[PDB]
């Protein structure tokens, strides 16, 4: 129903392989690969505000689903894309050669980003406030 | 008694002036100044683990009070210093020309970092799980 919450990273797969594939320096990969931080989502209807802890970087993006928005990626590149809401619990987008799916089930968010034959998956759990 | 917990930044004063004085790139100052993230402390006796969201960076430091420690600063430089306990609820350290005081008051943490005539102050609040 609502994505709003603070989510602590529980586990992830292929962080290093994904970050190497998009061109992140090995120095940043090693610094960030073991960080299990907190991301925050605020949802207001179709409007989303994301404060994402991704490795050693914090990225803050804002978008209305269905509208073109400029979003900052891991590389610092700002891409223009459209994020769609599928059902009430799935955010779907594609930028460059990456497909990203953000799925909420109960208190668990599963983020799956596919780049070629690399599937980068993050599992995070809502902090019960 | 215990600093352990997750803390969300509530307010801060003089971020830009402090970050300019320590030489952070202007582009990182502008993107980080409005981020209100979550920092995590894990305390075991005199041993501390910090995962700090500071602007658009995540910094992870460990140390034991009273023992010389190597700590990463906001600029990425590693400094060697000793963190002291003043009372039971204040952590105090000096490095370079900066004095840092971290004070716990119930669910509120206040971090005060003095550099010459600039006082950079962060107030955060415990996330109640
Ligand atoms: C498409 C813009 C974001 C770019 C950053 C990519 C790094 C992974 C992003 C996943 C965050 C999705 C929100 C769920 C919580 C989390 O996994 O932190
Ligand atoms: C002593 C250098 C540590 C890294 C420098 C980053 C500047 C901000 C440090 C403040 C963090 C103190 C912990 C309280 C929680 C918080 O304010 O995020």
Does A27 contact B at CB distance below 8 Å? no
Q: What is the 3-state secondary structure (H, E, C) of chain A?
A: CCCCEEEEEEEEECHHHHHHHHCCCHHHHHHHCCCCCEEEEEEECCEEEEEEEECCEEEEEEEECCCEEEEECCCCCEEEEECEEECCCEEEEEECCEEEEEEEECCEEEEEEEECCEEEEEEEEECCC
Distance CA A72, CA A23 (A): 15
Q: What is the resolution of this structure in A?
A: 1.6
CA separation, residue A51 to residues A38, A54, A113 (Å): 9, 10, 18
What is the distance of C-alpha B120 from the center of its chain? 10
Question: B24 CA to middle of ligand 1, Å?
Answer: 25
Say how far apart CA B10 and CA B3 lie, in whole Å. Answer: 17
- On chain B, the residues whose CB falls within 8 A of the CB of A62 are none
Domain boundaries, chain A: 5-126
State the method: X-ray
- Closest C-alpha among A54, A41, A38, A123 to residue B129: A38
Instruction: List Cα–Cα distances, A25 to A14, A21, A31, A61, B110, in angstroms.
Output: 16, 10, 10, 22, 34
Contacts of B55 in chain A (CB under 8 A): 58
Give the chain A residue whose CA is nearest to the CA of B37: A51
Which residues fall within 8 angstroms of residue A45, CB to CB, at 6 or more apart? none
Closest residue by Cα to residue A86 from A63, A110, A102 = A102
CATH fold of A5-126 reads: Lipocalin (2.40.128)
Strand partners, A98: A95, A115
């Amino acid at each position: 129903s609502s994505f709003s919450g603070k989510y602590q990273l529980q586990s992830q797969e292929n962080f290093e392989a994904f970050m190497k594939a998009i061109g992140l320096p090995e120095e940043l990969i090693q610094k960030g690969k073991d960080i299990k931080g907190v991301s925050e989502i605020v949802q207001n209807g179709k409007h989303f505000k994301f404060t994402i802890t991704a490795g050693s970087k914090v990225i803050q993006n804002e978008f209305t689903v269905g509208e073109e928005a400029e979003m900052e990626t891991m590389t610092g590149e700002k891409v223009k894309t459209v994020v769609q809401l599928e059902g009430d619990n799935k955010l779907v987008t594609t930028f460059k050669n990456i497909k990203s799916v953000t799925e909420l089930n109960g208190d668990i968010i599963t983020n799956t980003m596919t780049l070629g034959d690399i599937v980068f998956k993050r599992i995070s759990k809502r902090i019960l406030e």
